[PDB]
Amino acid sequence: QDLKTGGEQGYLRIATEEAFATREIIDVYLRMIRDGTADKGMVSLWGFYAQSPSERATQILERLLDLGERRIADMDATGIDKAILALTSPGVQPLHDLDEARTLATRANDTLADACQKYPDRFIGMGTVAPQDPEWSAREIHRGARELGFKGIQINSHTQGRYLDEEFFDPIFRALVEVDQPLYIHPATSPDSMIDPMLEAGLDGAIFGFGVETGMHLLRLITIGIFDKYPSLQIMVGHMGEALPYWLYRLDYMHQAGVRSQRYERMKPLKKTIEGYLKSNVLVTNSGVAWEPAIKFCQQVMGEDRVMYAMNYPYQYVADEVRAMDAMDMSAQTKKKFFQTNAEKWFKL
């Protein structure tokens, strides 16, 4: 079963959640780990990826750092026509020195824009920001859209234990709506306030902690009414929607029960059900979930227009996953939406 670029099978493969790193940023993580300012998540996640002697961690690091011929080759070998690229979690979000965070985010964005320019038919950019400074972040969203050819931004969930439902972060949403671009909420390790029981069992990372953190964050945003405030805003999440589609019946039941019993001041009546917001304002990718039953479930819940293919390169670079997706028992029209035309629509490619 051959994996070829060019769309001869009836669609292009557009991979919508693909990571890169910059040497300068990984070096800051290593410095933070050495000087004791790294949070427990950073020590766990980047203490491993930047310091494990294994062939595997080593290959992920090398692949993350390449934005040229090797990445193109890996894409060609798996039949990936286009990749939507974003700076790997947690970006500059954990950094205490804001001059450094803004400088390195600017440089990461510059580097990405240069790579997309060099490979305009293969690489598509999502910008990185420094939510610590929402006003600068808003300017960088405009710069991404205006000068850099970027299609949106990726935020790596929380910023130092603070979440985007806080009014403090509103300039970011204001800017996304001004440029009419989607937000990808990508996972991160939980903050120190929440991580301990997961970390002790080995569950703080992609196995579990990622989905908890990210699902929590998107749920918080839905329930604060972000989509009533910003009805045009689209938020994309990976990993088959961080379980929210499967939890949907219970989410809506318990959300309505809480509101009606006036349990939490924070939880106020919304204009739509959570189901309603999933169908109008949330977009999902299958990153890390090359599994047909889950994909089909999620298509049924959210609509086939709102579920997209993502590989999660280089953390999950598996040719047999692409093969299993190419071979799903799904109509030609639906498969082409999933691999290609959904992404083309929602990222305005």
Ligand X SMILES: COc1cc(C(=O)O)cc([N+](=O)[O-])c1O
Burial class (CB in 10 A: 0-12, 13-18, 19+), 266: exposed
CB of 193 to a second copy, least distance (A): 5
Note whether 229 binds a second copy by CB under 8 A.
no
Contact between 181 and ligand X by CB under 6 A: the answer reads no
Binders of ligand X among residues 38 to 97 (CB under 6 A) are 88-89
Bridge partner residues of 18 (DSSP): 85
In 3D space, the residue among 199, 172, 204 whose CA is nearest the CA of residue 188 turns out to be 204
Q: What is the token pair recorded at 178?
A: 């001004």
- Helix and strand numbers (H, E) in the chain are 17, 8
Q: Is 51 in the site for a second copy (CB under 8 A)?
A: no
Helix pair 134-146, 170-179: axis angle to 10 deg: 10
* 3-state SS class at 85: strand
The footprint of a second copy on residues 313-332 (CB under 8 A) is 316
Residue 178: contacted member of Cl ion, a second copy, ligand X, none (CB under 5 to 8 Å, by partner type):
none
Decide: is 251 part of the binding site for ligand X (CB under 6 A). no
Q: How many CB atoms lie within 10 A of CB 250?
A: 10
Cβ-based neighbour number of residue 78 at 10 Å = 21
Apex 68 CA angle, 114 and 5, nearest 5: 110
* Residues in CB range of 300: below 8 A, 6 or more apart: none
Residue in the shown chain whose Cβ atom is closest to ligand X: 315
Q: Assess 342 for contact with ligand X (CB under 6 A).
A: no
Restricting to residues 259-318, name those near ligand X by CB under 6 A.
Answer: 287-288, 312, 315
Specify the DSSP class assigned to residue 283: E
* Contact call for residue 243 and a second copy (CB under 8 A): yes
The SS3 of residue 90 is coil
Residue nearer to a second copy on the CB measure, 6 or 56:
56
Nearer to ligand X, 313 or 347 (CB): 313
Closest listed residue to residue 110, CA positions, set 144, 78, 154, 141: 144
Q: Could you give the CA distance from residue 59 to residue 75 in angstroms, rounded to a whole number?
A: 15
Q: Which residues contact 167 (CB under 8 A, 6 or more apart)?
A: none
C-alpha 102/C-alpha 347 separation (Å) is 25
The piece of 70-78, 205-213, 222-230, 330-338 that touches ligand X (CB under 6 A) is 205-213
Does 19 engage in binding with ligand X (CB under 6 A)? yes
Candidates 134, 144, 171, 191: give the one binding Cl ion (CB under 5 A): 191
Distance CA 130, CA 25 (A): 13
The interface mask with Cl ion, positions 84-103, x = CB under 5 A, is: --------------------
Position 223 contacts a second copy (CB under 8 A) = yes
Q: Binding marks (x or -) toward a second copy, 93..132, rule CB under 8 A? A: ----------------------------------------
Contact residues for Cl ion, defined by CB under 5 A: 39, 161, 191-192
Contact residues for a second copy, defined by CB under 8 A: 48, 52, 54-57, 158, 161, 163, 165, 190-191, 193-198, 200-203, 205-208, 211-212, 215-216, 219-220, 223-224, 239-240, 243, 245-251, 253-255, 257-258, 260-267, 288-291, 293-294, 297, 300-301, 316
Contact residues for ligand X, defined by CB under 6 A: 19, 88-89, 187, 205-206, 210, 238, 287-288, 312, 315
